[PDB]
Ligand binder design. Structure first.
Ligand SMILES: CCCCCCCCCCCCCCCCCC(=O)OC[C@H](COP(=O)([O-])OCC(O)COP(=O)([O-])OC[C@@H](COC(=O)CCCCCCCCCCCCCCCCC)OC(=O)CCCCCCCCCCCCCCCCC)OC(=O)CCCCCCCCCCCCCCCCC
Ligand SMILES: CCCCCCCCCCCCCCCCCC(=O)OC[C@H](COP(=O)([O-])OCC(O)COP(=O)([O-])OC[C@@H](COC(=O)CCCCCCCCCCCCCCCCC)OC(=O)CCCCCCCCCCCCCCCCC)OC(=O)CCCCCCCCCCCCCCCCC
Ligand code: BCL
Ligand code: BCL
Ligand code: BCL
Ligand SMILES: CC[C@H]1c2cc3[nH]c4c(c3C)C(=O)[C@H](C(=O)OC)c4c3nc(cc4[nH]c(cc(n2)[C@@H]1C)c(C(C)=O)c4C)[C@@H](C)[C@@H]3CCC(=O)OC/C=C(\C)CCC[C@H](C)CCC[C@H](C)CCCC(C)C
Ligand SMILES: CC[C@H]1c2cc3[nH]c4c(c3C)C(=O)[C@H](C(=O)OC)c4c3nc(cc4[nH]c(cc(n2)[C@@H]1C)c(C(C)=O)c4C)[C@@H](C)[C@@H]3CCC(=O)OC/C=C(\C)CCC[C@H](C)CCC[C@H](C)CCCC(C)C
Ligand SMILES: COC(C)(C)C/C=C/C(C)=C/C=C/C(C)=C/C=C/C(C)=C/C=C\C=C(C)\C=C\C=C(C)\C=C\C=C(C)\C=C\CC(C)(C)OC
Ligand code: HEC
Ligand SMILES: CCCCCCCCCCCC[N+](C)(C)[O-]
Ligand SMILES: [Ca+2]
Ligand SMILES: [Ca+2]
Ligand SMILES: [Ca+2]
Ligand SMILES: [Ca+2]
Ligand SMILES: [Fe+3]
Ligand SMILES: [Mg+2]
Lengths: 42, 63, 318, 68, 259, 44, 277, 42, 41, 52, 51, 42, 56, 44
């Protein structure tokens, strides 16, 4: 409505966005695990 | 002065002279009071009169 | 005598102009425009509206936080005395960490507040640059203004961030104050041996004088031919009338060469930008590859020599 | 000691130093200095010694205690 | 990785030489941009050579640049060709660099300060396609600012302080609200002429308009419009140039000198 | 409540709230980093 | 020579002095009577500068390096009298020649704009820079009391003069008229950058787009800062800022020494000694 | 009615405003009691 | 006053409340972990 | 404390007072926290307590 | 004081008066609190009482 | 009526204005009595 | 002094004079209080009277 | 939750998110480098 984007075109964007978020967070978590294994900070 | 002096207001309107005089005397009075406060001879607050009754510690003599 | 077009003798009022419509997906402009009579004697007598998006809101928040921190520290430096704050306002400041910390984070009272204020101010400036770029692109225009702002930001970051990191200490940065930052400017020149002998300082001063000269010439030229409709520069650029021809011919007869109505605005653009570019380089070379500019100039045969009429005995050389 | 050991300062033109040079008739000299604490600060604030108008540096915003 | 390249060279010297090279390039670029109007030059060297040697100097000219005008007004090349013209004057002396004499009647001569090119014969337009400069008789939503004289009915006096007519209408600008022209109803030919604001002084005390360019009897030769509701870029230039010519040709004492 | 959104345009309020939260988070982390008793980027 | 549209404007008359005696063009330049006078003043000034470089301060420190050539004013013991040629009179002759050349240039501009039928804004603006130079080398030396207070003629030596004059007041940043002039200079630079950027952006739009109109110029700056000044007013403001900077710089330099002989920070004591605090 | 509200609109606004202000002051009171118990200042 | 009807504000309010609750819950758990690591009072 | 106090909303626009009061309250809270952090007697972070 | 003082409100705009007095009172309260904080006798935080 | 308020519209502003100023001064009185009891200044 | 002074309100606008009087009086009160606080004799807060419960 | 894209434009949101992520990464790397205990630009 406000941006003139139909809900059916919103579901497809939301799915790809959340899939990308999950993929990004997996790499971030792995990198932090390795960083802790190198030198713990707590 | 001359009896016919009252014609002066046929050239100057009352409003623009009343405002100017009232805004002028106040400024002059403020300026004179500040000038007197600046001197050590005519400062009525710090002249030490009458007495002190206020105690006046190490000091900094550079200032 | 003759009408010099310095002030508007008779004004005309038309209804307010909202502005060129924006494309879809934009917020409406805020505020209702109003007219000022005294402001209309020198320029346009209409104020507002303004456009405020998301980048503009973030810039406002970041900048207000930074300014609040600076003001709070200035007030704390006089022990919460507001009258003494007004008395000493031009002399107060917030100042960088001590030289014994390097690039680390000191306590709040010893330079943490300065670091936080600098970070937030830099964020606000970057967001405002993004805002200018977006507003230029929304109307279909080009991006000259954002490039000039980028040059200004480059000089600002060289002054406050890049050079201290290269030198390895935060104490090389400038304080937040009126008289404090002038003191910093003087001490910087004293410490590095007479910045008058820095050649990029010379170029920057030349470009500043040139900007003043160019703006005086262009303003006087346009005001002189405005009786022919010369102030409407776009029409003259797309269809050359007597204003542009006379303006070119005047300068051709005066100094032998001339510019164009379109071309002169390029001379204006490059002269100002080069003022800050050469500035940013000039301080990045100071303290990193040159230690004393006077001795550097003597090494390269630039400093003049005077007859020896006054001299002193060196007490370290006895 | 001033009049015999520091003649490269106080005896270039033979001016000399007397008790009247400092006191000028007063038991306590008029132009002495001490270690300046500066303006008051909050309890948890670390002083900087500058950014404050002071006649000891001729009314500039420079460090106001160069004596120490 | 240090600051001394050799025994004499250092970094701060190479940097200044690189800046000088860049500055030379920038100056060449700016001078090439300057030469999009009025080149190649018109000199004796070209005409003696039978139109063979073209005087452009250094650097030479750039490739043509295209401007596209809104509302389908057309396309204009920044460096273009224009038709050589025959001026309305005659040289004072045959040596090069000599001035010309404005042959005929100087006001009605089209030479000197009273000269102008021939611009496009179409009205300037707004963002919606309307004419830009129009009289207040059609821009009814406009108004005169408060506490201002409203110069309708004011008498216009000539150079010598003799009345030459009265103001009848005011021509304003739709895109930027300001006055561009005054309309004078001349009481010598029963005609109406335009007067630019840049040539008129408002005597707001006694309600007068002063025109120091031309005299009162000269308001009878101002170039006229084609239609009474709009003006074109050609006619505006002609009208302004006619008044500008009076700054030199009005009286016998305006040609100089002082001594 | 809920009718408060008839007063406030959701987009501007959401953007302002998110900006304020980000600024507050950065400020709190900076203040903790400046205090030696809570700096976690040391040897401890 | 002539632009392709210039021949219509080469008319006779409009001279101030000379009439038809010097009314001609030399290449692209118009000369006139003041053209002759200014050109020969400039020529003699240049030749005397070159001779002063040839003589040098001594026979040992004489050099043709362009950064190191300097012609110096007399001593303060000569007062306002005329010094010997080798001891500072060459500086005075060159100063007179420079003043003559500048005034001739301004008068030639007046003649040119009388010929073209345009306003007189340009020579009027040039007169401000001429007045600043005259304050530097005429008004301040007379008020102080000697010609030795002028600055030396050299590319690098007049920088030494500026530095030493600045440090005669221990902190020159605290001069108030100096602050005003600097504010005007910086504001002028900002305004020039913005004017050039906007004109170029409107004239050179995005690819496949038409030239923008006058409404876009106002809309852009109303959407950035909430106010637009207009096409004529930006040139008004540019001229105003550029002339105010020079006027306040002249004021700032003419009060240093003649009207104030102490450090510049101390001048602010009137604010710190008010009874309010 | 310069702001454009009607009588019912103002009546409904005032009740919510006072309710929310009362809740905010109520939580502030508890925070201050806890602070006083932690470290009294008077 | 913002181009929003009753339902178009109720949906927004429900989503807003749920998101706020999730954010506050994770904030609380983070503060519990931090207090276990190094108490400040 | 007056039966007809709600008429105050017929004079001042609520939307432009909510923003003002929110901003004022936020800045006031920040300032009080910073003032407490600027005194050695109430800095809860540098006090050492508990357990140093 | 005469009872007819209520005619003041048809001479000055009530909204401007309300906002001006609110701003003035808030600024005055802040200023007085800070001036008290600047002293040694009336600084309730650094007074050391109770210890 | 330059302000535009009617005879009764402006007359009832006074009744609420004074009724609120009374309570503001009333609580200020209590605050100052407490402050004097804590630590007198004169 | 004069039974006809009430004509003054036929010349100067009362709405302007009310504001110019209230603002002026407020500024004057602030200035006089600051002047008193800038002295060692009439500074009622730092005079040490009565007593001094804090140490400095 | 998916209708959040009826409030904000996806393209501008993606660009802003990328810019924020890059700035945050630079900030964290610089903070780590400045501290001595975690600087990795010394070898070992
Ligand atoms: C050895 C010697 C070395 C030199 C050797 C060569 C010597 C001879 C050189 C001859 C030529 C001289 C120049 C003349 C050419 C010319 O004028 O072109 C006409 C051309 C005419 O354009 P136009 O007709 O208006 O085009 C309109 C079109 O519609 C649209 O046009 P367009 O989009 O196609 O134009 C391309 C455009 C690119 O357009 C785009 O990419 C799309 C739109 C922009 C997107 C990118 C945004 C901008 C990037 C900056 C982001 C900022 C982020 C926040 C701030 C961070 C700050 C650090 O070009 C740029 O804008 C480049 C980006 C510049 C931005 C930053 C500039 C200031 C910051 C300086 C940083 C520090 C420098 C220190 C050194 O003008 C330009 O192209 C201007 C370009 C930008 C000007 C500045 C460029 C850098 C200059 C550096 C000067 C100092 C160098 C010192 C070197 C020596 C000392 C070491
Ligand atoms: C950090 C910056 C530091 C900068 C340091 C340097 C600053 C000072 C530079 C001094 C430049 C002096 C220029 C003299 C111009 C003379 C007129 C002329 O023809 O112009 C040539 C040239 C254009 O020539 P043209 O129109 O293509 O030639 C037409 C045909 O060639 C026509 O063909 P033609 O057969 O006629 O060719 C002969 C040609 C002869 O050409 C030359 O003599 C060489 C000129 C260039 C050397 O033209 C003449 O006939 C001239 C006759 C002169 C007679 C003089 C004796 C009587 C005069 C009396 C006057 C009244 C007193 O104009 C320029 O090169 C101007 C360049 C400006 C560069 C300024 C760079 C720095 C600006 C500051 C930076 C600001 C920020 C920028 C962003
Ligand atoms: C330690 C030194 C002090 C200091 C001491 C001084 C002294 C001393 C002076 C200034 C002056 C100035 N200072 Mg300062 N100043 C300092 C620091 C600064 C800083 C800074 C960033 O810190 C800035 C921005 C400035 C800026 C300024 C300007 C306000 C001003 C110079 C412009 C001017 O006068 O135009 C004037 C322009 C002209 C005179 C141009 C004249 C040209 C005419 C037209 C002649 C024609 C030229 C030529 C012959 C033509 C032919 C050439 C070729 C053949 C074509 N100062 C430091 C702190 N400053 C000067 C001033 O105010 O003078 C009035 C001045 O005397
Ligand atoms: C020696 C220093 C003394 C001191 C000696 C004096 C003396 C003497 C006087 C004051 C006066 C004032 N002092 Mg004191 N004062 C001291 C310490 C303080 C302290 C403090 C922090 O300790 C405070 C907050 C004040 C504050 C005040 C103000 C209440 C008052 C100036 C008001 C004003 O600016 O009018 C400017 C604004 C206006 C005039 C607006 C017009 C007001 C309206 C139109 C008329 C009154 C209506 C009113 C608002 C409502 C009804 C009131 C009725 C008349 C009952 N004083 C110390 C202890 N103070 C003056 C006073 O008494 O005023 C009443 C005065 O003469
Ligand atoms: C202890 C300190 C460690 C260190 C510990 C960590 C930890 C922990 C992390 C990083 C992360 C990063 N570090 Mg590190 N890092 C160190 C020193 C370095 C050095 C160096 C010069 O020494 C470099 C070049 C880097 C580089 C990086 C970046 C790649 C990354 C942050 C980028 C960013 O801000 O995204 C912001 C910008 C965007 C998100 C835009 C995205 C653009 C698109 C999406 C690119 C995707 C390409 C492709 C699809 C990716 C998948 C394909 C893969 C090749 C499989 N690190 C030191 C040695 N570093 C983070 C990371 O892994 O991020 C991925 C992370 O969690
Ligand atoms: C070519 C080089 C010159 C230059 C160029 C230049 N400057 C520029 C630009 C350009 C091309 C812009 O596009 C940009 C701009 O927006 O121009 C209109 C700008 C600009 N140059 C500015 C300043 C500036 N430029 C300077 C100099 C120069 N700018 C060079 C001489 C200087 C100097 C000499 O010191 C200054 C001070 C800004 C006005 C503006 C960029 C503003 C900006 O980025 O702001 C970001 C931060 C904020 C908006 C924070 C605001 C937070 C709150 C609103 C604060 C609330 C409290 C408030 C301040 C209290 C007071 C009351 C208020 C109502 C005022
Ligand atoms: C007042 C506002 C600004 C301004 C305006 C301005 N300048 C102008 C004009 C205007 C309006 C012109 O119309 C005029 C012009 O023709 O411009 C192209 C000009 C001009 N401004 C110029 C320069 C100039 N303007 C400067 C400044 C400024 N000009 C101000 C910032 C500066 C600075 C800041 O240093 C300089 C160097 C010239 C390019 C030109 C005037 C040319 C002229 O007068 O020519 C006649 C003289 C000669 C050709 C030779 C003179 C002979 C002498 C013996 C030379 C040496 C004299 C000197 C005293 C000794 C050496 C000094 C040492 C320091 C080296
Ligand atoms: C009523 O008003 C209130 C009280 C609310 C607020 C009022 C405030 C007032 C009166 C403020 C007055 C401010 C003044 C006078 C400011 C003067 C400022 C001046 C002249 C500044 C001039 C130059 C300063 C410069 C150039 C500083 C530049 C610093 C930079 C670029 C630093 C960047 C630092 C970074 C990015 C550091 C990053 C390190 C990390 C991220 C670790 O830091 C946390
Ligand atoms: C000449 C030979 C004399 C004599 C007889 C005295 N002085 Fe000095 N003096 C100086 C300073 C800085 C002080 C300390 C300030 C102070 O104590 O007042 C003094 C102190 C004294 C005293 C003690 C006075 C007192 O407070 O009780 C006396 C009795 C005394 N002086 C005698 C400084 C200087 C000088 C400057 C370098 C010089 C020279 C002298 N004094 C010389 C003398
Ligand atoms: C942002 C540009 C990259 C900066 C990298 C360097 C960061 C600072 C490192 C300084 C380390 C100094 N020291 C002594 C702690 O080793
Ligand atoms: Ca007394
Ligand atoms: Ca604790
Ligand atoms: Ca206590
Ligand atoms: Ca007391
Ligand atoms: Fe222009
Ligand atoms: Mg400092």
């Amino acid at each position: 409505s406000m941006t003139g984007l139909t809900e059916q075109e919103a579901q497809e964007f939301h799915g790809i966005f959340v899939q990308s978020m999950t993929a990004f967070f997996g790499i971030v978590v792995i990198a932090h695990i390795l960083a802790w294994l190198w030198r713990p900070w707590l | 002065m001359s009896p016919d002096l009252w014609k002066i207001w046929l050239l100057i309107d009352p409003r623009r002279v009343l405002i100017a005089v009232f805004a002028f005397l106040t400024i002059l009075g403020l300026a004179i009071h500040m000038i007197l406060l600046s001197t050590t001879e005519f400062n009525w607050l710090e002249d030490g009169i009458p007495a002190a009754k206020v105690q006046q510690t190490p000091v900094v003599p550079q200032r | 005598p003759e009408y010099q077009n310095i002030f508007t003798a008779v004004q005309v009022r038309a209804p307010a102009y909202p502005g060129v419509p924006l494309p879809k997906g934009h917020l409406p402009r805020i505020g209702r425009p109003i007219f000022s009579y005294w402001l209309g004697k020198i320029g346009d007598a209409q104020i507002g509206p303004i456009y405020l998006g998301f980048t503009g809101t973030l810039s406002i928040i970041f900048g207000f936080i930074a300014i609040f921190i600076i003001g709070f520290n200035m007030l704390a430096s006089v022990d919460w005395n507001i009258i003494q704050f007004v008395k000493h306002f031009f002399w107060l400041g917030l100042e960088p960490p001590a030289p014994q910390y390097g690039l680390s984070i000191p306590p709040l009272s010893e330079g943490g507040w300065w670091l936080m204020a600098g970070f937030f101010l830099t964020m606000s400036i970057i967001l405002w640059w993004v805002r200018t770029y977006k507003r230029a692109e929304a109307l279909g225009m080009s991006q000259h203004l954002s490039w000039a702002f980028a040059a200004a930001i480059f000089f600002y970051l060289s002054l406050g961030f890049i050079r201290p990191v290269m030198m390895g200490s935060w104490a090389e940065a400038v304080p937040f104050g009126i008289f404090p930052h002038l003191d910093w400017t003087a001490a910087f020149s004293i410490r590095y041996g007479n910045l008058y002998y820095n050649p990029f300082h010379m170029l920057s001063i030349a470009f500043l004088y040139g900007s003043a000269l160019l703006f005086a010439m262009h303003g006087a030229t346009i005001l002189a031919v405005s009786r022919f409709g010369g102030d409407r520069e776009i029409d003259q650029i797309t269809d050359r009338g007597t204003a542009a021809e006379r303006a070119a011919i005047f300068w051709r007869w005066t100094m032998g060469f001339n510019a164009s109505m379109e071309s002169i605005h390029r001379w204006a653009w490059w002269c100002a930008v080069l003022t800050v570019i050469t500035a940013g380089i000039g301080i990045l070379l100071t303290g990193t590859v040159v230690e004393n500019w006077y001795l550097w100039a003597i090494k390269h045969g630039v400093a003049p020599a005077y007859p020896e009429v006054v001299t002193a005995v060196d007490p370290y050389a006895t | 000691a001033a009049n015999s050991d520091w003649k490269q300062h106080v005896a270039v033109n033979g001016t000399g130093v007397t008790c009247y040079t400092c006191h000028r008739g007063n038991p306590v000299p008029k132009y002495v200095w001490v270690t300046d604490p500066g303006p008051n600060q909050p309890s948890g604030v670390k002083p900087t010694g500058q950014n404050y108008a002071s006649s000891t540096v001729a009314y500039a915003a420079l460090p106001f205690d160069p004596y120490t | 990785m240090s600051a001394a390249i050799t025994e004499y060279m250092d970094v701060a010297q190479l940097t200044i030489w690189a800046f000088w090279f860049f500055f030379a390039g920038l100056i060449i670029y700016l001078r090439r941009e300057d030469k999009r109007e009025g080149y190649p030059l018109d000199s004796d060297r070209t005409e003696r050579s039978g139109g063979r040697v073209k005087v452009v100097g250094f650097p030479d000219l750039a490739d043509p640049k295209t401007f596209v005008l809104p509302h389908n007004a057309g396309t204009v090349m920044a460096p273009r060709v224009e038709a050589p013209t025959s001026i309305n004057a005659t040289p004072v002396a045959p040596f090069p660099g000599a001035p010309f004499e404005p042959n005929g009647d100087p006001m009605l001569s089209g030479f000197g300060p009273a000269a102008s090119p021939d611009r496009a014969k179409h009205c300037d337009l707004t963002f919606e396609g309307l004419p830009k400069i129009v009289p207040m008789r059609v821009a009814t939503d406009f108004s005169i600012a408060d506490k201002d004289p409203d110069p309708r009915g004011m008498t216009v006096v000539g150079l010598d302080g003799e009345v030459a007519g009265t103001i009848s209408d005011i021509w304003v600008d739709r895109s930027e609200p300001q006055i561009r022209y005054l309309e004078v109803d001349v009481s010598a030919t029963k005609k109406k002429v335009l007067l630019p604001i840049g040539f008129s002084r408002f005597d707001k005390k006694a309600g007068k308009v002063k025109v120091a360019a031309i005299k009162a009897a000269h308001f009878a030769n101002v170039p006229a419009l084609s239609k009474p509701d709009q003006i074109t870029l050609y006619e505006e230039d002609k009208v302004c140039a006619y008044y500008a010519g009076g700054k030199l040709y009005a009286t016998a004492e305006r040609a100089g000198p002082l001594l | 409540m809920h009718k408060i959104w008839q007063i406030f345009d959701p987009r501007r309020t959401l953007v302002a709230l998110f900006g304020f939260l980000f600024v507050l988070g950065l400020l709190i982390h900076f203040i903790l980093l400046s205090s030696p008793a809570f700096n976690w980027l040391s040897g401890s | 020579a002539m632009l392709s549209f210039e021949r219509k404007y080469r008319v006779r008359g409009g001279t101030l002095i000379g009439g038809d005696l010097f009314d001609f063009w030399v290449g692209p330049f118009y000369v006139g009577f003041f053209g002759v006078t200014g050109f020969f003043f400039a020529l003699l000034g240049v030749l005397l500068i070159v001779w002063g470089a040839t003589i040098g301060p001594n026979a040992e420190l004489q050099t043709y390096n362009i950064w190191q050539i300097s012609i110096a004013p007399p001593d303060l013991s000569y007062g306002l009298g005329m010094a010997p040629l080798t001891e500072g009179g060459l500086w005075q002759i060159i100063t007179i020649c420079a003043i003559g050349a500048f005034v001739s240039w301004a008068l030639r501009e007046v003649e040119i704009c009388r010929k073209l039928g345009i306003g007189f804004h340009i020579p009027f603006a040039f007169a401000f820079a001429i007045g600043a130079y005259l304050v530097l080398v005429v008004v301040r030396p007379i008020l102080m009391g000697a010609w030795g207070h002028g600055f030396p003629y050299g590319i690098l030596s007049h920088l030494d003069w500026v530095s030493n004059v600045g440090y005669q007041f221990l902190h020159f940043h605290y001069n108030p008229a100096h602050m005003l002039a600097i504010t005007f200079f910086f504001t002028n630079c900002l305004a020039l950058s913005m004017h050039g950027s906007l004109i170029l952006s409107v004239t050179n739009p995005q690819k496949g787009e038409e030239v923008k109109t006058s409404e876009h110029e106002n809309t852009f700056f109303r959407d950035i800062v909430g106010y637009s000044i207009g096409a004529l007013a930006i040139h008004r403001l540019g001229l105003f800022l550029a002339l105010s900077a020079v006027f306040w710089s002249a004021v700032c330099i003419v009060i240093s020494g003649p009207f104030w002989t102490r450090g510049w920070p101390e001048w602010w004591n009137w604010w710190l000694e008010l009874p309010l605090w | 009615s310069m702001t454009g509200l009607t009588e019912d609109e103002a009546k409904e606004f005032h009740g919510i405003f006072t309710q929310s202000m009362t809740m905010f002051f109520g939580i502030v009171i508890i925070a201050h009691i806890l602070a006083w118990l932690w470290r009294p200042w008077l």
